Write a protein that binds this ligand. Sequence first.
Ligand SMILES: Cc1cc2nc3c(=O)[nH]c(=O)nc-3n(C[C@H](O)[C@H](O)[C@H](O)COP(=O)(O)OP(=O)(O)OC[C@H]3O[C@@H](n4cnc5c(N)ncnc54)[C@H](O)[C@@H]3O)c2cc1C
Ligand SMILES: N#Cc1ccc(Cn2cnc3ccccc32)cc1
Ligand SMILES: [Mg+2]
Length: 279
Amino acid sequence: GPVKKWECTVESNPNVATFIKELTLRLPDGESVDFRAGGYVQLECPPHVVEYKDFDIQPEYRGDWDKFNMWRYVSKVDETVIRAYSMANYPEEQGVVKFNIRIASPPPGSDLPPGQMSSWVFNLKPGDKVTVYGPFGEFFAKDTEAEMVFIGGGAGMAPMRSHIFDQLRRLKSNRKISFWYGARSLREAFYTEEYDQLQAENPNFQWHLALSDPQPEDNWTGLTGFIHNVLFENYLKDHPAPEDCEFYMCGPPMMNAAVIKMLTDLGVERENILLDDFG
Ligand SMILES: Cc1cc2nc3c(=O)[nH]c(=O)nc-3n(C[C@H](O)[C@H](O)[C@H](O)COP(=O)(O)OP(=O)(O)OC[C@H]3O[C@@H](n4cnc5c(N)ncnc54)[C@H](O)[C@@H]3O)c2cc1C
Ligand SMILES: N#Cc1ccc(Cn2cnc3ccccc32)cc1
Ligand SMILES: [Mg+2]
């Protein structure tokens, strides 16, 4: 049916990585969003001014905000803006919509305006009101028996979480499913307890965190490098039939491109690769 509108309330908005927040919105009582995993809603902001020094950023992430001179940015938005954000919750988690949102600050050293909506999102405090429209979606799972390979980075975590819980918790799928998540260092990884629990509950599920720049404090001995190299060397190189898998990708643009080239070089058909392009 037609687009629905909900006036929601912010429940929480912590950082989950240096430049990503988990925004949770409480729908007005007695309402829920009838969405499909991989789908999204539109958030709206009114005209405003936000100053980055007003943000609540958890302590461990502040040093990089200082390093990147983030606190001096100011965003002036003179008209209502609408932007799409993917649901991080899966359809059964009701009463809320949860998001993973990256702050799109100006290219460093440029004089460009800060990202309009994401700068506003980063100043949202518990109790603030946010208008939401939807549901929408097209990044949906195929209904087959094929092995699934989920590949995420950055705020592309959100549809990955929605997809993976939807398969394992609602569809109770016995399909072979793996999730490969690329991040710079341990500080940028999140939902690790959730995926570890899903792996311990479902023998058909396996997840892999790969760090491209592990920090000294990480003492990292896990998978290391960029996710396309890691996924190839640790799983797809020896796979008997990678072209029989369904690949679901959502990351930053450079990651999307590198993973796609890797896959097609392997002989995977672009029709077996589904990309959520945040744009
Ligand atoms: C279906 C869909 C789902 C999405 N899901 C998510 C999600 O789950 N999480 C998420 O974080 N994002 C998601 N996105 C992206 C999101 O909708 C926004 O595009 C993103 O948040 C940036 O919007 P913004 O208004 O903050 O920045 P914008 O105002 O659109 O600015 C974007 C960037 O451009 C820079 N810029 C400004 N002016 C210029 C200029 N003249 N030249 C060059 N650069 C300039 C800004 O400083 C900023 O870095 C999704 C998008 C789609 C379409
Ligand atoms: N948002 C975000 C985000 C940005 C970079 C990385 C590091 N990373 C890992 N694999 C990569 C492939 C190509 C390019 C970068 C890559 C991870 C997440
Ligand atoms: Mg306020």
